[PDB]
Design an enzyme around this catalytic site. Structure first.
Site, mmCIF file in Angstrom:
data_model
loop_
_atom_site.group_PDB
_atom_site.id
_atom_site.type_symbol
_atom_site.label_atom_id
_atom_site.label_comp_id
_atom_site.label_asym_id
_atom_site.label_seq_id
_atom_site.Cartn_x
_atom_site.Cartn_y
_atom_site.Cartn_z
ATOM 1 N N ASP A 62 0.813 -1.202 0.000
ATOM 2 C CA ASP A 62 0.000 0.000 0.000
ATOM 3 C C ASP A 62 0.854 1.262 0.000
ATOM 4 O O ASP A 62 1.899 1.318 0.648
ATOM 5 C CB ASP A 62 -0.919 -0.006 1.229
ATOM 6 C CG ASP A 62 -1.840 1.204 1.279
ATOM 7 O OD1 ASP A 62 -2.752 1.305 0.431
ATOM 8 O OD2 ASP A 62 -1.646 2.061 2.164
ATOM 9 N N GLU B 293 1.716 -0.480 -4.946
ATOM 10 C CA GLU B 293 0.714 0.469 -5.397
ATOM 11 C C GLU B 293 1.386 1.788 -5.724
ATOM 12 O O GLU B 293 1.850 2.498 -4.832
ATOM 13 C CB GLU B 293 -0.364 0.745 -4.339
ATOM 14 C CG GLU B 293 -1.314 1.839 -4.836
ATOM 15 C CD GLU B 293 -2.116 2.521 -3.750
ATOM 16 O OE1 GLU B 293 -1.643 2.591 -2.596
ATOM 17 O OE2 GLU B 293 -3.222 3.014 -4.067
HETATM 18 CL CL LIG Z 1 -4.556 -1.166 -6.005
HETATM 19 NA NA NA Z 2 -3.374 4.262 -1.501
#
Ligand SMILES: [Cl-]
Ligand code: NA
Ligand SMILES: *[C@@H]1O[C@H](CO)[C@@H](O)[C@H](O)[C@H]1NC(C)=O
Ligand SMILES: [Ca+2]
Ligand code: NA
Ligand code: NA
Length: 496
Positions: A197, A233
């Site tokens: 993330d 990401e």
């Molecule tokens: Cl994603």
């Molecule tokens: Na994000």
């Protein structure tokens, strides 16, 4: 890091967004395994802030309180029970790792957490880890607000707070070690990889230092020397100093340009059309196929929270969505992730959804179980796109044609296109405002094939459209611009 570690012949992952561990466990056994799905991306399994204003929003799970595997999806035992049962049927688990930050700096101190752990954002104390003021980037960040203010400055993007989220000092070995401790525990109990993330907000080198501390996958379920699959990401739409390629040394990267552009051509925005997709892939400015994690929509941008903007197709645009997902699953570019969502009271005002914060279906904040209806669709407001025949069958299509080259491309210079995957599959699309009726070279062996979009191959027969391939590989396709699903797909395993 680049390999998903799925069982051979399994080519997709499904994001069972906000699903409880017990439901995913069952889903692995009753559906994912027999339908050939490769794995599941689970929501953050670590303890997060319980936010009541608004009421339990989906995004509260991106505000960590500790690394205890204790959330609204289940406790530590239920989590491992899930990984074990899924691995036992050859379906992998990929953890959404929120390791860039802890919660918002303005969140009130106390025990309003999913596991009751105490935390004090103001004093920078998260004793359950434990983290203290020494583990955050307060002193490192140079912006006047302490938050990220300008993306043209790669340094603050990494050292300052993303929308106020307390930023961890990932250069410190102590912090790197606490994160690795969390990730290695997960690896050891069976997870096959991670979604990192907010990777754009972490230095490529810090991520690398953390990955250096990770173990090889569980040797009881995986071959010796297997490394965890890593997809970072990074929303890179082209106009910033930070490029997703800067992260290739750590693993794959989410290719947000993929869904954005596929959405604009299928919606036919700015004169774009499907005939332009002949060179789909790197030709469109995307990262190399072997470094791409692709998808039509994500939990973020399906509700206008991330990037791709207004062009993103979602289950709300069911007809065009299925076709977009179909094209993605048929095309060889990247490693595919299909979305599985929940229905929320979308409410537009001035072009923006004021209910885009709404969390998963719940009873007093307790996430509702996923119920399976007789027709195999889901109840309790879970959309279950992965169960839609048109999508599930394309997930299988991708498995069937794996390794086969992109060939026999056809287009009418507008929105009626088609292409094959070696001699194992062929797909035809009609997104024009008129009918498509033509004989195409399919590259497939002669015979009768079941169209897997309109139906299924069931006991030596087809429930929907049937396609007849002649000795020269040609076949006639007829798709009305008014068809329920304006695309047809046939493959080696749908042949009678
Ligand atoms: Cl994603
Ligand atoms: Na994000
Ligand atoms: C296919 O369906 C027909 C009836 O529509 C039946 O006569 C035939 O035996 C079925 N074929 C197989 C292989 O089950
Ligand atoms: Ca950061
Ligand atoms: Na393998
Ligand atoms: Na290696």
């Amino acid at each position: 890091q680049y390999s998903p570690n799925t069982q051979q012949g399994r080519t997709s992952i499904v994001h069972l967004f906000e699903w409880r561990w017990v439901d995913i466990a069952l889903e692995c056994e009753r559906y994912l395994a027999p339908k050939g799905f490769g794995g599941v991306q689970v929501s953050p399994p670590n303890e997060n802030v319980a936010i009541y204003n608004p009421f339990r929003p989906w995004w509260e799970r991106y505000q960590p309180v500790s690394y205890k595997l204790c959330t609204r999806s289940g406790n530590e035992d239920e989590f491992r029970n899930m990984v074990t049962r899924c691995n036992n049927v050859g379906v992998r688990i990929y953890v959404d790792a929120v390791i860039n930050h802890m919660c918002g700096n303005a969140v009130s101190a106390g025990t309003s957490s999913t596991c009751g752990s105490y935390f004090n954002p103001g004093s920078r104390d998260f004793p359950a880890v434990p983290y203290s003021g020494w583990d955050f980037n307060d002193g490192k960040c140079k912006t006047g607000s302490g938050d990220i203010e300008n993306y043209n400055d790669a340094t603050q993007v990494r050292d300052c707070r993303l929308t106020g989220l307390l930023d961890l000092a990932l250069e410190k070995d102590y912090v790197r070690s606490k994160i690795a401790e969390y990730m290695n525990h997960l690896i050891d109990i069976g997870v096959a990889g991670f979604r990192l993330d907010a990777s754009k907000h972490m230095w490529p080198g810090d991520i690398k230092a953390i990955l250096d501390k990770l173990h090889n996958l569980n040797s009881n379920w995986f071959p010796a020397g297997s490394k965890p699959f890593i997809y970072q990401e990074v929303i890179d739409l082209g106009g910033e100093p930070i490029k997703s390629s800067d992260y290739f040394g750590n693993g794959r990267v989410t290719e947000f340009k993929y869904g954005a552009k596929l959405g604009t051509v299928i919606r036919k925005w700015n004169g774009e059309k499907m005939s332009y997709l002949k060179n789909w892939g790197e030709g469109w400015g995307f990262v190399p196929s072997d470094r791409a994690l692709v998808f039509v929509d994500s939990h973020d941008n399906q509700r206008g929270h991330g990037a791709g903007g207004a062009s993103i197709l979602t289950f709300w645009d069911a007809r065009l969505y299925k076709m977009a997902v179909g094209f993605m699953l048929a095309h060889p570019y990247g490693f595919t992730r299909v979305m599985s969502s929940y229905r929320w009271p979308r409410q537009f005002q001035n072009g923006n959804d004021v209910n885009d914060w709404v969390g998963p279906p719940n009873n007093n904040g307790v996430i509702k179980e996923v119920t399976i209806n007789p027709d195999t669709t889901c109840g309790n407001d879970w959309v279950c796109e992965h169960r839609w025949r048109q999508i599930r069958n394309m997930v299988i299509f991708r498995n069937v044609v794996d390794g086969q080259p992109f060939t026999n491309w056809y287009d009418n210079g507008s929105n009626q296109v088609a292409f094959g995957r070696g001699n194992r599959g062929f797909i035809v699309f009609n997104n024009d405002d008129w009918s498509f009726s033509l004989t195409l070279q399919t590259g497939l062996p002669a015979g009768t094939y079941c169209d897997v979009i309109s139906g299924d191959k069931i006991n030596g027969n087809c429930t929907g459209i049937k396609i007849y391939v002649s000795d020269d590989g040609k076949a006639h396709f007829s798709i009305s611009n008014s068809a329920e699903d304006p695309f047809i797909a046939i493959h080696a395993e749908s042949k009678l």
